[PDB]
From a paper:
The CgsWT and CgsiGP samples produced high resolution maps of the full-length protein. The CgsWT map contains a disordered density docked at the active site of CY, which could potentially correspond to a glucan chain reaction intermediate. The CgsWT and CgsiGP3 maps obtained in the presence of UDP-Glc contain additional densities of glucan chain fragments bound to the protein at the cytoplasmic side of the CTD. This surface, which stretches between the CY and GP enzymatic pockets, appears to contain affinity sites capable of coordinating the polysaccharide.
The production of the main CβG chain occurs in the cytoplasm and is orchestrated by the cyclic glucan synthase (Cgs), a large, multi-domain membrane protein that contains several enzymatic sites.
Residue numbers in the entry: 20 to 1528, 1536 to 1962, 1964 to 2012, 2020 to 2027
Write the structure that this text describes.
């Protein structure tokens, strides 16, 4: 075991420890491998070599080759080997790798961490285990410890060493394969020529190829053990090998090495890579770390936000790096100085707050004490901090001043009396200010690290001393909105259920002029009842979590309505005193209860949603003592502390089912990105305060002090800025809170001008030094005012610019004006393409810049076209605000009642123009005023003014709704056809559901071959059936009572259905309700059933709350059934005796009924009396259909009758729905409530904990109750259907988020973008989550779905056949045919080799994809409908296209199967498409699933990785067709035909025999030089007198341009001579032991040819040995005789005793294509031969003496018939010859009445094809393997010998007597002598025994001998291993003695027996030197090469 890998005598545990300990003091000085190199270049070369050795192996093994076990892992798992090649180079930038210390291993210097990698890949078998590395690092750290980072590099450096060994093994295994087969052709050339002179010249060249210790292994084997061998070929190999004295067998054994070791190490490499990928390294690093041992005691490092712990570690490492001190004492000396920091807290009485000096206030003192010298970046940052807010405002002002100076220098050329330049500069500097602040933000993001806040870890929830009440300010315009407000509260509670957390709602009954209208009591009482009901459901631990607080309002001092003390700040404050033991708060009596302390309060809002367990982060961060506010006693402002923490906010992807183009263009930041850790902001990294926009967390005491100290009455909501400025703020940027953006262009300007009004209202605080305001806060309000003033400045600047100046160069100024707006957003865009000073070389990553370029361009265009409207509206707002600022009005608390806009209707162009009416008028008036002066401003002004005036038009265009996944525009015809298809498909459920322990789908159901139902049930079937029932009720196909009955029956059945811990077993019985096989539980079935039951229960609740409006329905099914009837009626042929009156009458009646239905649907009130009369019309249609049927008994007439029936009970169901009492719905409410309860109970019943593998996460494939063991693998990909099950399992609570965040995510480049990688990428694995869940436009899943559907459509175009590939039952039938089942997909998204040879189309695929693309799917469905794919109950299962399984000349194949599994999905998809996805909300209407819905969404990352990559039509599987032109001048070939007990053999020229059950039918002998024995068909020319044969072998006519086909089923013979050709195909029939010889003759001449046909067969019935012993007897007992209707001759042996079998045989003439002619017989061979003649020169084929018709007890009987044919020019003649036999005479008559009739040949060819397909499927054979086995049988059945042993070894052996002693008599046995000695392959013997079993089915009898040839050490183990597989055949066959299989152990038996066996063996083979089914083909290419001239003689 050498190879070239790195192995160093594996030593196991307790030796690695000592090795590392020795290495610590004095080690290395050598390595098992090692070589001088450099990192990056070596890694790149490794990449190149791995790609090559991979691409070469892929281009090989497809042309036909044997793949080594070592190459199996590389081919199968190249993808995993790739990303491990990645994830390094990424984790080692050049500078980072440089710092690693030196080790100096013998001269050269090596990184210390990577040197340990070489020591531990070697003392293993390339296996990595956690405990091994732990022991090694423990042993190594005895003297010198491993610092932080180095211990972070072992996982990223081991993979570098591992792939190096992979390269060293792959480069050798690839070389060892091609050069192995190099000897194959050389020895072929050696054996081709029998020379002894040129052989030396040939062998001299390969002198350099003899020292390689694998060339000789195959060369010597193929020579010595091959066959012919040589005395000089193996004469130099030994002599040359004598160098180094390795003798002969040492090299033999050396090839045994370097192979098994290679395979083992190659497998171990992949196993180790998988283990490293799956294992966690943070926990292992924490365990084995040394610096963390000190930091576990005396400090709280354990529970401190692991990311923040890493921040501590980074700070410690940075301090240690730049200071002249080691790393250990940095974390130790800090503790000593922090020991004097004093406890300073309640919980903190013990322990030491080390973070107070590391990240806290005392960082500078720590740095000064430790001697650390700050970095220049830290120096400039601290200078910035010591400056203050001015360091931020100064650069922007400087840039604006520079821009102003530049523009003033440029714009000084048109006079400017200097009283207008000031105005222009003031109005232009604001875009300059925006550009300057954008540039400053970009640069600070580039150069300043973001800010992170340290917090606690509340793993068990928020504990005592921190109580949070989630006060969600809310409103109350209720009646039904209170229900969704409670839903929001419930979802928020479900978001963070852990910990001592309370929830409540704070609201206010609007603003009314009255203090209390007293009518709110009913709404208040209803709200209290809802709260009480919500309290009971979650009554756990006796915790009244949900409260309700409502304010009573007080009248405003100035005016308006009762609005409290303040609209919001008010509620917040009077809540603040409420929690502080205050009782005079005027909220309300009764509902004024609070849970005691509640130190913290969530602000939140009525719409924003919360991340799961997000509050556990903010609460811990604020409870951290460093973040606790201090409050300044002199003036409360919190000098050092964080009273307010604000979380970062990102908008939602789509506002429910509405996404307009306006949404996409004015919101760039969308989606949730898992990778981003922290975002950088200009404010927090430069001032350490953030912005408390609308949400956050505050301390009650600090907030109360800061607000009540300075706040005053009469302030607008702008309190948020003031409240944040009071104490402090801090953007945590680690907690997310989603929100939405309005889609209609009415509210955006509303909120914008309200905030502008608030900002302007903040001006008095800016202008006043008194009160309380910060200079930085003053600057931020000034910036807000500047942002408000930008559009007015721009607009008025333009207005004055085109007027005052009016030059010819005025275009440049507007160019710069729009250039500023282009510049403003684009700087942040460039922040993605910056490489940060060429960090690493990038991979393929796409560019996709067009999307954001278009977005920016459209956004700027919309901004410049709406700027006038925005400016006008918010200037009105500014004037209104300034009125209150100056005059001090009483209107400054207005929220929304402004009458300026007062929008009260939907958008319309007729509405915006009237409501705005201001900005376009102002613009046009300004243009008219400024156009006439100067006479040069019109050209510049016209296009721009036309842009502004058309503002309402583009606003209306962008306000319109757009389709994403549920509002798709489908029109009517597409929807009509989809509903029609669904209704037609639904007939299956009616047909196959009736109570017989039923209400379970019956799974598959065949149609053609005696249709049967397989009573097996799966949970997925139940779920899809329930969804189908819901969809059917939605469509109105069924009444309201029938749905209840079906649901109740299904629920009862599933309750009585046995369960294992709530889960359901894999398979069930419909009739007996018992488990079918082994008890197996799969995660897919339980997840699917739970997901569907959720929707069922939600819908039950939906129509149980108000069971009156859901009664009617839609009244659309009765139109779909009418359309079905119309379509069916068109296909009825109408050319009969009575023409077509009834068809016409039905046509007018149907169109009249359709018109009446349309008229009723047009009515709005939906009269019940109108639909009653339609039942009469339906009954009339039924009677007319019955009248049509009574005269024509066609199947389609029955279909018409059935589809009329379905219509008339559809009408009955609608009437019954209209016939409900509708007066007592309370019992119905009870029924629906009970159904909902029993449905949702089963939803939560299953427990998914036991399927969770807590070593590598993810859900296992399944569970087996036996042995209580998990299967093995897990669903390791996002593209799996289990993502619904995972979502439910994580939402239920028994799973963490690491489950969801550790599976899939891979991308494959297709087109411009990328999609999701799949295993067996059929969209069966994609479509289910869209069916049940909700998908948004911006999500990854929808984009991937679009890409995959486009790719499948393109694949369908390129292949030619219709598209759509998914798993189904492909065209292959087993014993008791069931059509089988397997998976399919597309090659691009497969990851599985062999998916390109299927070519299978599934009809249900097209309807599945109809959701995303309706038109293409509809066209594909129509294309399928053109073919035969529509059955009785809908579309069939699949259609086949692979040419191997394609029968006859048909283009395609049809599978007649219906699956209950693939039918409900179609109905669900149709319901989703037609009714705008009702099922989308049904699943998502449950609080439990709605709480975890936010794990969805996310954006497509933006950088696709791209891994390594008529061929589509050239890769389909193809069978083998043996095409032979002229067999006469070639060697013979044999084809076998057998039905299992009737076998016949056919040679290359029509010779052969027929064996029945082991006896003979026609005499046959093995004459190699004659081959003229068997049945022959003779053709004679009447006019010329010449006679010949159809095969022409016994005659041979000059010319003879023949052809031959010997494919399966039929053997085809071709022969043409003299413008006359004869083609004959011979096939054996089925069910009657009949062999058919159909002679087919065609003529293309110009004259009538008069020729005759003659038959010749010899009936012999014996035991194949008695006949060959004394033929006279067996000839004599034959009793050939012909009876009436002289076309059949029956011959049976006369009976001697009671032991003879009998087996009467007969021959059939069965004339065809002839009016009337008589046949003649010559049943006597004595007159046929002629006493001295032969077959080639016969006597009967002579003028005269023509078939004297001798019959009886003839001495030498045969069977022969003659039939003259009349074949004119251009027409056809056909005659069939039948060879039949039967054990009894009475059975012959039962078969003669089936072939004597005309035709009788078609419909048996298909039977033979089906039977041979079944036989070849029963045993794992292949067409090429079948051909090889038939060639082997040809060699075995004839005394031809071409692959036997040598001509020298066999001489001194073969006594033939020493065979019975070894139990192998070998009397009636040609014997085969496969020899094996490897024990490694164990596959050649399996193929040999499979061939023998195959040969046993074709009437070939021989015994298989496997000669074990291993030494006695492993001989017993090898014998047991081979018996493990042979014992399936060593058992006796069905009553014969012993079976034909043998095995001998070489050591025990004597040498003489082995020599005799090898000499007498017909074929000798070795397992190494060749392969089964491949050595047979090599003989034909080697044994080849004057017997041609005498042919045509």
């Amino acid at each position: 075991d050498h190879n070239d890998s790195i192995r160093a005598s594996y030593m196991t545990i307790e030796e690695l420890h000592d090795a590392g300990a020795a290495l610590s003091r004095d080690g290395a000085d050598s390595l098992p491998g090692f070589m001088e190199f450099d990192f990056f270049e070596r890694h790149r070369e490794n990449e190149k070599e791995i790609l090559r050795v991979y691409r070469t192996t892929a281009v090989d093994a497809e042309n036909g080759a044997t793949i080594t076990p070592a190459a199996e892992w590389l081919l199968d798992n190249h993808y995993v080997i790739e990303e491990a090649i990645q994830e390094v180079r990424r984790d080692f930038p050049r500078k980072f790798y440089r710092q690693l210390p030196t080790m100096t291993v013998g001269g050269v210097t090596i990184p210390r961490v990577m040197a340990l990698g070489w020591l531990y890949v070697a003392h293993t078998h390339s296996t990595v285990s956690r405990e091994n590395m732990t022991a090694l690092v423990d042993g190594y750290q005895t003297s010198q410890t491993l610092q932080i980072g180095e211990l972070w590099a072992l996982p990223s450096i081991i993979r570098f060493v591992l792939i190096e060994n992979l390269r060293r093994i792959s480069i050798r295994v690839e070389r060892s394969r091609r050069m192995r087969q190099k000897a194959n052709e050389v020895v072929d050339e050696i054996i081709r020529l029998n020379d002894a002179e040129a052989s030396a010249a040939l062998l001299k060249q390969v002198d350099s190829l003899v020292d390689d210790p694998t060339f000789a292994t195959q060369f010597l084997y193929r020579l010595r053990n091959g066959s012919q061998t040589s005395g000089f070929a193996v004469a130099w190999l030994e002599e040359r090998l004598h160098a180094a004295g390795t003798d002969a067998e040492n090299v033999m054994m050396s090839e045994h090495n370097r192979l098994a070791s290679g395979n083992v190490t190659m497998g171990n490499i992949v196993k180790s890579l998988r283990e490293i990928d799956d294992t966690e390294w943070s926990v292992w690093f924490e365990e084995v770390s040394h610096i963390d041992k000190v930091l576990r005691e005396e400090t709280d490092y354990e529970i401190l936000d692991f990311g923040s712990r890493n921040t501590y570690r980074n700070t410690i490492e940075l301090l240690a790096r730049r200071s002249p001190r080691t790393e250990v004492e940095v974390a130790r000396a800090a503790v000593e100085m922090a020991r004097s920091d004093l406890p300073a807290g309640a919980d903190e009485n013990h322990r030491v707050n080390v973070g107070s000096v590391l990240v806290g206030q005392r960082r500078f003192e720590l740095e000064k004490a430790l001697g650390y010298r700050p970095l220049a970046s830290q120096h400039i940052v601290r200078s910035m901090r010591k400056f203050n807010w001015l360091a931020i405002a100064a650069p922007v002002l400087l840039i604006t001043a520079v821009a102003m100076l530049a523009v003033g220098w440029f714009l000084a050329k048109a006079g400017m009396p200097w009283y207008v330049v000031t105005a222009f500069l003031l109005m232009f500097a604001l875009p300059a200010s925006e550009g300057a602040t954008g540039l400053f933000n970009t640069l600070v993001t580039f150069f300043v690290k973001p800010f992170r806040l340290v917090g606690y870890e509340f793993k068990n929830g928020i504990p005592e001393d921190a109580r949070t009440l989630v006060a969600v300010p809310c409103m109350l315009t209720s009646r039904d909105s209170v229900d969704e407000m409670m839903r929001n509260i419930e979802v928020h509670y479900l978001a963070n259920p852990h910990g001592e957390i309370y929830f409540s709602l704070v609201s206010d009954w609007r603003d009314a002029p009255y203090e209390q209208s007293d009518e709110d009591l009913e709404i208040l009482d209803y709200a209290k009842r809802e709260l009480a009901a919500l309290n009971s459901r979650y009554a756990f631990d006796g915790k009244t979590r949900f409260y309700l607080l409502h304010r009573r309002r007080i009248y405003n001092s100035a005016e308006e309505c009762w609005m409290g003390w303040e609209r919001k700040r008010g509620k917040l404050h009077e809540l603040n005193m409420l929690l502080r033991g205050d009782k005079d708060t005027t909220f309300l009596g009764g509902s004024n209860i609070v849970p005691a302390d509640v130190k913290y309060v969530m602000t939140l809002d009525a719409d924003t949603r919360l991340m799961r367990d997000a509050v556990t982060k903010l609460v811990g961060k604020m409870h951290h003592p460093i973040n606790r506010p201090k409050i300044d006693p002199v003036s409360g402002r919190v000098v050092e502390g964080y009273g307010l923490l604000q979380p970062r906010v990102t908008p939602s992807l789509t506002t429910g089912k509405d996404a307009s183009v306006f949404q996409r263009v004015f919101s760039i930041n969308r989606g949730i990105d898992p990778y981003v850790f922290t975002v950088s902001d200009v404010y927090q990294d430069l001032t350490s305060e953030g912005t408390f926009t609308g949400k956050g967390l505050y301390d009650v005491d600090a907030f109360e002090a800061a607000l009540k100290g300075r706040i005053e009455e009469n302030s607008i909501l702008s309190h948020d800025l003031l409240e944040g400025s009071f104490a402090r703020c801090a953007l945590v940027t680690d907690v997310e809170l989603v929100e939405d953006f309005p889609t209609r262009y009415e509210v955006e300007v509303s909120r914008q001008h309200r905030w502008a009004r608030g900002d302007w209202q903040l001006l008095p605080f800016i202008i006043d030094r008194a009160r309380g305001v910060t200079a930085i806060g003053r600057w931020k309000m000034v910036d807000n005012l500047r942002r408000s003033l930008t559009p007015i400045a721009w607009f008025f600047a333009s207005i004055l610019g085109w007027y005052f100046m009016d030059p010819l160069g005025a275009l440049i100024w507007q160019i710069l004006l729009i250039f500023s707006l282009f510049v403003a957003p684009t700087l942040s865009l460039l922040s993605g393409l910056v490489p940060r000073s060429t960090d690493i070389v990038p991979q393929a990553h796409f560019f996709t810049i067009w999307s954001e370029i278009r977005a920016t361009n459209a956004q700027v265009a919309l901004r410049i076209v709406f700027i006038a409207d925005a400016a006008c509206m918010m200037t009105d707002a500014i004037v209104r605000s300034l009125y209150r600022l100056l005059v001090s009005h009483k209107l400054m608390l207005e929220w929304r009642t402004a009458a300026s806009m007062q929008s009260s209707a939907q958008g319309s162009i007729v509405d915006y123009y009237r409501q705005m009416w201001h900005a376009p008028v102002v613009a046009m008036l300004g243009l008219l005023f400024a156009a006439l002066p100067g006479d040069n401003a019109f050209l510049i002004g016209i296009p721009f003014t036309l842009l502004w005036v058309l503002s309402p038009a583009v606003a209306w265009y962008v306000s319109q709704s757009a389709e994403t996944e549920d509002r798709l525009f489908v029109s009517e015809h597409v929807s009509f056809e989809l509903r029609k298809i669904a209704r037609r498909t639904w007939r299956y459920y009616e047909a196959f559901v009736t109570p017989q322990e039923n209400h379970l789908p019956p799974d598959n159901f065949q149609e053609t071959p005696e249709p049967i139902v397989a009573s097996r049930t799966s949970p997925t079937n139940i779920g899809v059936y329930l969804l189908s029932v819901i969809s059917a009720r939605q469509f109105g196909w069924i009444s309201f009572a029938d749905t209840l009955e079906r649901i109740e029956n299904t629920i009862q059945t599933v309750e009585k259905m046995e369960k294992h811990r709530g889960h359901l077993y894999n398979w069930y019985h419909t009739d007996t309700l018992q488990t079918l096989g082994p008890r197996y539980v799969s995660a897919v079935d339980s997840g699917n059933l739970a997901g569907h039951l959720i929707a069922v229960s939600s819908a039950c609740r939906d129509w149980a709350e108000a069971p009156s409006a859901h009664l009617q329905g839609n009244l659309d099914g009765i139109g779909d059934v009418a359309g079905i009837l119309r379509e069916t009626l068109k296909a009825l042929p109408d050319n009969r005796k009575t023409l077509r009156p009834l068809h016409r009458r039905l046509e007018e009646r149907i169109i009249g009924f359709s018109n009446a239905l349309a008229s009723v649907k047009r009515e709005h009130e939906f009269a019940s009396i109108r639909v009653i009369n339609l039942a009469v019309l339906a009954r009339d249609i039924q009677k007319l259909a019955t009248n049509v049927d009574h005269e024509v008994k066609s199947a389609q007439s029955a279909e018409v009758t059935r589809w009329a029936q379905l219509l008339v009970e559809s009408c009955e169901a609608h009437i019954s729905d209209s016939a409900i009492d509708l007066t007592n719905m309370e019992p119905l409410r009870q029924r629906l409530a009970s159904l909902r309860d029993r449905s949702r109970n089963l939803a939560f019943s299953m427990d998914f904990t036991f399927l969770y593998r807590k070593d590598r996460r993810l859900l296992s494939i399944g569970y087996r109750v036996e042995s209580k063991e998990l299967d093995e693998a897990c669903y390791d990909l996002l593209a799996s259907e289990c993502r619904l099950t995972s979502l439910f399992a994580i939402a239920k609570g028994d799973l963490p988020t690491e489950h969801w965040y550790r599976l899939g995510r891979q991308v494959v480049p297709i087109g411009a973008q990328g999609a999701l990688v799949s295993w067996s990428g059929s969209m069966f694995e994609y479509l289910m989550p869209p069916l049940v869940m909700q998908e948004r436009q911006g999500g990854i899943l929808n984009q991937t779905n679009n890409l995959i559907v486009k790719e499948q459509m393109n694949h369908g175009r390129r292949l030619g056949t219709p598209w759509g590939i998914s798993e189904a039952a492909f065209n292959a039938r087993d014993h008791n045919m069931n059509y089988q089942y397997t998976n399919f997909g597309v090659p691009t998204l497969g990851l599985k080799r062999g998916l390109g040879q299927n070519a299978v189309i599934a009809p249900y695929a097209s309807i599945l994809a109809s959701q995303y693309d309706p038109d293409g799917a509809l066209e594909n469905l129509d294309k399928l409908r053109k073919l035969g794919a529509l059955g009785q109950y809908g579309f069939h299962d699949a259609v086949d296209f692979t040419p191997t399984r394609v029968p006859d000349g048909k283009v395609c194949a049809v599978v007649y199967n219906y699956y209950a599994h693939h039918h409900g999905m179609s109905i669900a998809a149709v319901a989703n498409v037609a009714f705008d996805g009702v099922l989308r909300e049904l699943f998502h209407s449950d609080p439990v699933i709605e709480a975890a819905e936010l794990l969805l969404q996310e954006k497509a990352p933006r950088e696709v990785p791209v891994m390594s990559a008529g061929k589509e039509q050239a890769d389909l599987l193809r069978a083998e067709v043996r095409s032979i032109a002229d067999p006469a001048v070639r060697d013979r070939e044999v084809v076998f035909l057998s039905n299992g007990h009737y076998s016949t053999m056919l040679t290359s020229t029509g010779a052969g025999y027929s064996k029945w059950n082991g006896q003979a039918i026609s005499r046959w002998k093995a004459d190699p030089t004659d081959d003229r024995w068997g049945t022959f068909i003779f053709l004679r020319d009447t006019t010329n007198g010449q006679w010949w044969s159809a095969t022409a072998e016994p005659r041979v006519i000059e010319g003879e341009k023949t052809k031959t086909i010997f494919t399966d089923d039929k053997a085809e013979f071709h022969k043409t001579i003299g413008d006359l050709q004869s083609v004959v195909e011979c096939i054996v029939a089925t069910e009657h032991d009949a062999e058919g010889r159909r002679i087919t003759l065609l003529n293309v001449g110009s004259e009538d040819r008069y020729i005759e046909v003659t038959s010749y067969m010899e009936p012999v019935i014996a035991s194949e040995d008695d006949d060959n012993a004394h033929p006279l007897f067996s000839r004599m007992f034959v009793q050939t005789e012909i009876g009436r209707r002289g076309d059949v001759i029956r011959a049976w042996r006369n009976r001697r005793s009671q032991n003879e079998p009998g087996t009467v045989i007969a021959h059939l003439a069965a004339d065809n294509a002839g009016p009337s002619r008589p046949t003649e017989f010559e049943t006597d061979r004595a007159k046929f031969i002629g006493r001295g003649r032969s077959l080639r020169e016969a006597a009967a084929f002579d003028a005269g003496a023509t078939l004297s018709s001798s019959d009886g007890f003839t001495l030498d009987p045969i069977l022969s018939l003659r039939r003259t044919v009349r074949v004119p020019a251009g027409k056809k003649v056909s005659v069939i010859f039948w060879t039949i036999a039967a054990p009894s005479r009475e059975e012959v008559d039962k078969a003669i009445d089936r072939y004597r009739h005309p035709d009788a040949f078609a419909h048996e060819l298909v039977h033979a094809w089906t039977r041979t397909q079944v036989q070849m499927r029963h045993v794992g054979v292949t067409s090429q393997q079948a051909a090889a086995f038939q060639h082997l049988g040809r060699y075995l059945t004839y005394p031809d010998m071409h692959l036997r042993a040598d001509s020298e070894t066999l001489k001194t052996g073969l006594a033939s007597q020493r065979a019975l002693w070894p139990l192998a008599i070998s009397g009636d046995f040609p014997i085969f002598s496969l020899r094996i000695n490897d024990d490694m392959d164990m596959d050649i013997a399996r193929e040999a025994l499979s061939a023998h079993e195959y040969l046993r089915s074709r009437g070939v009898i021989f015994d298989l001998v496997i000669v074990n040839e291993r030494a006695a050490s492993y001989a017993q183990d090898m014998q047991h291993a081979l018996d493990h597989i042979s014992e399936t055949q060593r058992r006796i066959n069905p009553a014969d003695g012993r079976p034909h299989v043998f095995s001998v152990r070489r050591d025990l038996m004597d040498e003489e027996t082995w020599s005799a066996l090898l000499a007498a063996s017909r074929v000798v083979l070795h397992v190494r030197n060749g392969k089964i089914v491949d050595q047979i083909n090599r003989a034909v290419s080697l044994f080849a090469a004057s017997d041609a001239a005498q042919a045509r003689l």
